[PDB]
């Protein structure tokens, strides 16, 4: 742990600095150091963690897609043989992506999830576990692809069950988890109908609970509801 000698509060301070500087790899390294101090994360600290890794893996995913599309093109009838470089470099980016996902899942498994007893922390980490298995599923093509998909599904499902029992239908974590699990169905599990039904039911139950909110909670909730509707528009 290169971050072993830095104060927990100093790691969190530098995480926020790296965020402002758009240095998300640094941000991620600082938050991994913080998690490895062994203490539970507060709400704000969990969000620093997810923000850091979302941006790192988000750039890796965008590169991987660019390289996949090139590689698939060099495989069309009538493409000129280019040698192994496109596949090699796609594999390099792909390996590095998987290593980031393995790092995040390692943090959840040692020991974020097992200590998370409040709904807000447990659902948040289970959502993350589903997301990072989903990112692994997007590049999976092997013996393990089914089990990686089922790992995503299983994490999302446990997070759904707790969120339905313990949080109001407008809770932003509950909404974001539903949004992502609905994308999992559409994009990964080949179940566009489940994806549609989940996004529609989530949207409509949140709608009917907006009346209970303050104006700031209303903003946070309708922001994510709009993403559900944008997906529905995309899919229908």
């Amino acid at each position: 742990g290169a971050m072993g000698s830095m104060e927990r509060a100093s790691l969190i301070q530098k995480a926020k600095l790296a965020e402002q500087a758009e240095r998300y790899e640094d941000m991620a390294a600082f938050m991994k150091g913080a998690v490895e101090k062994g203490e539970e994360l507060s709400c704000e600290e969990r969000n620093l963690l997810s923000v850091a890794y979302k941006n790192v893996v988000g750039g890796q995913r965008a590169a991987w897609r660019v390289l996949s599309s090139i590689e698939q093109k060099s495989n069309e009838e009538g493409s000129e043989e280019k040698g192994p470089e496109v596949r090699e470099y796609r594999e390099k980016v792909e390996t590095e992506l998987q290593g980031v996902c393995d790092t995040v899942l390692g943090l959840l498994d040692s020991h974020l999830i097992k200590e998370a007893g409040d709904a807000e922390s447990r659902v948040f980490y289970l959502k993350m576990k589903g997301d990072y298995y989903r990112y692994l599923a997007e590049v999976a093509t092997g013996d393990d692809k089914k089990r990686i998909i089922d790992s995503a599904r299983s994490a999302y499902q446990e997070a759904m069950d707790i969120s339905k029992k313990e949080m109001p239908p407008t809770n932003p974590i509950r909404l974001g988890l539903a949004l992502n699990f609905s994308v999992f169905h559409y994009e990964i599990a080949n179940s566009p109908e489940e994806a549609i039904s989940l996004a529609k039911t989530t949207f409509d139950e949140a709608m009917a609970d907006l009346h209970t909110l303050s104006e700031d909670s209303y903003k946070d909730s309708t922001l994510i509801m709009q993403l559900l509707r944008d997906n529905l528009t995309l899919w229908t």
């Binding site: 992502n180 994009e187 995309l234």
Partner: peptide, 5 residues
């Protein structure tokens, strides 16, 4: 691509 958070 569809939206995720």
């Amino acid at each position: 691509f569809p939206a995720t958070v």
